[PDB]
Amino acid sequence: PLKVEKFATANRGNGLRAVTPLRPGELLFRSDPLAYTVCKGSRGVVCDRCLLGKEKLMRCSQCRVAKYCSAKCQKKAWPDHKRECKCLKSCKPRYPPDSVRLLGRVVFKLMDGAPSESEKLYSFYDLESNINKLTEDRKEGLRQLVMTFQHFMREEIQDASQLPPAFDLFEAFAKVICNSFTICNAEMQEVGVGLYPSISLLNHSCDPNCSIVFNGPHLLLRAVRDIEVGEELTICYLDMLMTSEERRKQLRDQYCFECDCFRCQTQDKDADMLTGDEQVWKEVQESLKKIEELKAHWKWEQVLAMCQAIISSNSERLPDINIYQLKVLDCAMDACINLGLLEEALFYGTRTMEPYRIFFPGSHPVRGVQVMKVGKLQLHQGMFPQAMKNLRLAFDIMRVTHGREHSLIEDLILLLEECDANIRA
Ligand SMILES: O=C(Nc1ccccc1)OC[C@@H](CN1CCCCC1)OC(=O)Nc1ccccc1
Ligand SMILES: C[S@@+](CC[C@H](N)C(=O)[O-])C[C@H]1O[C@@H](n2cnc3c(N)ncnc32)[C@H](O)[C@@H]1O
Ligand SMILES: [Zn+2]
Ligand SMILES: [Zn+2]
Ligand SMILES: [Zn+2]
């Protein structure tokens, strides 16, 4: 009972196409991960199982690496965790890269788990490796990952008899490179990485007709515009706040392809993204390397101090449509929200609104969430007509990008009903 099918494309490998016309908001596929793990920066901040941020988390007894919010989460995680637990115990004080911990979970799921529904349309065995396009530099990095894997997993995997038949570690890490999904929480904070082999049939577009969203580790795939019969389904692999040049480099380095899409041919939005003084935004782009690192580790006080030094600098400033200024405004808004500084969060949040409209066209889940945050801030401060306007805009977007199957849509409906009741009274 599916509206999509695998097919062989003319020049981008296998892909997914619609077998019937699709309309905005239509759910096309949903999947738990084949395997997933919390990311470096969120380890110890979010529960290893449900990926939610809780202040009280309990370490697993044996390895004291995995953390859980509840007995329920520890129990539901134990099948995925039992064999890596001894390895993490084996390997402390060292912690292995996310990709190595992820592939460990793949190998254990394929060795010990029932066939996974995440592989319904496409399996880990099927995934693109791009090995004949990897540079010598990439291949050397892959060889280091293999040896790191062999080290980390020695307590549980000694020889090939404990790997799937004809399982090649080098090809396996090559697949992880170009098929890994970044798992975001409801607030669009990156909290994990996973493999979803059926979803990995989707080729990329800088102007996609589909979008994915995460509800915990669970993934929803939705159409975000009208799609004709037989049309290829695409998602955007990349953050929207990137120039065509930046997209080219990342698509080359990680995915081994050159994008022929119409936005890349025309450098669509590049000029407006880079307005302001070049010397100023080069420095902000540098500072953002540390700001985003701090944010990935949830160090909100330090994020905020670094952002304020830019937003309210004594030296030259950038227009809010400059993508690097815009990223700074967004980091500062999220830090204020997490620190309970709601007046400041709203000031930064409202400044992001018009640039987000430009740079996230149509229905994009990231703009839907940003608008909902600004609406919620306005609601908590008693600005009801303005909050209502933004909450309704968020719903117009998120009914398409998130849908009834995403728990966040229920929370938005509650905010809509509360803010409406405040206006009616
Ligand atoms: O209150 C805040 N932050 C917050 C506060 C004021 C203004 C803007 C944001 O976080 C609480 C957290 C816990 N939920 C409490 C209510 C239902 C159960 C879960 O959910 C969220 O609101 N996050 C969220 C996610 C996406 C978009 C907007 C907000
Ligand atoms: C997640 S996989 C998508 C499915 C892939 N086509 C396959 O056959 O398995 C990502 C890989 O698909 C290819 N690809 C994805 N989007 C592309 C595009 N827009 N143009 C050319 N190749 C693309 C690249 O090889 C990339 O590394
Ligand atoms: Zn949990
Ligand atoms: Zn453990
Ligand atoms: Zn493109």
Question: Does residue 288 sit in the same domain as residue 253?
Answer: no
Question: Does residue 49 sit in the same domain as residue 29?
Answer: no
Q: Would residue 190 count as lying in a domain?
A: no
**What approach was used to elucidate this structure?**
X-ray
Tokens representing 308 are: 């304020």
- Report whether residue 39 contacts ligand 1, using a CB cutoff of 6 Å: no
Q: Give CA–CA dist 183/76, Å, rounded.
A: 19
CATH classification of the domain holding 227: 2.170.270.10
Which ligand is located closest to the Cα atom of residue 413? Answer: 1
Q: Residue 214: in which H helix or E strand, if any?
A: strand 210-215
Domain containing 22 equals 1-33+196-268
Residue 24: cis peptide before it, omega within 30 degrees of 0: no
User: Which residues partner with 184 through β-bridges?
Assistant: 190
Residue 224 contacts residue 208 (beta carbons within 8 Å): yes
Phi, psi (deg, nearest 5) at residue 422: -70, -35
Q: Would residue 368 count as lying in a domain?
A: yes
- The resolution of the experimental structure, rounded to one decimal in Å, is 1.9
Question: Does residue 93 sit in the same domain as residue 113?
Answer: yes
CATH classification of the domain holding 339: 1.25.40.970
> Ligand 1: which of 54, 214, 366, 376 to mutate, most ligand atoms within 8 Å of CB?
376
Q: How many domains would you assign to the chain? A: 4
Residue 87 contacts residue 152 (beta carbons within 8 Å): yes
Residue written as tokens 């997209």? 247
Q: Give CA–CA dist 362/399, Å, rounded.
A: 12
* CA torsion through residues 245, 247, 250, 254, sign: negative
Max Cα–Cα distance, the chain, nearest Å: 71
Residue written as tokens 């728990």? 407
Q: Which of 351, 375, 410 is the last residue of a domain?
A: 351
Q: Would residue 187 count as lying in a domain?
A: no
Tokens representing 88 are: 């993490």
Question: Does residue 371 sit in the same domain as residue 318?
Answer: no
Which ligand is located closest to the Cα atom of residue 66? Answer: 4
User: CA-based angle 343:348:353, to the nearest 5?
Assistant: 120
Q: Give CA–CA dist 411/413, Å, rounded.
A: 5
Tokens representing 138 are: 């990439």
Q: How far apart are the first and last CA of the chain?
A: 47
Tokens representing 99 are: 């990709």
- Report whether residue 418 contacts ligand 1, using a CB cutoff of 6 Å: no
Q: Residue 210: in which H helix or E strand, if any?
A: strand 210-215
Q: Would residue 373 count as lying in a domain?
A: yes
Question: Does residue 284 sit in the same domain as residue 213?
Answer: no
Q: What is residue 352's three-state secondary structure? A: helix
CATH classification of the domain holding 390: 1.25.40.10
Cβ-based neighbours of 417, under 8 Å, separated by 6 or more: none
Tell whether residue 13 is among the known ligand binding residues: yes
Q: Which of 302, 318, 351 is the last residue of a domain?
A: 351
Ligand 5 centroid–CA 244 distance in Å is 7
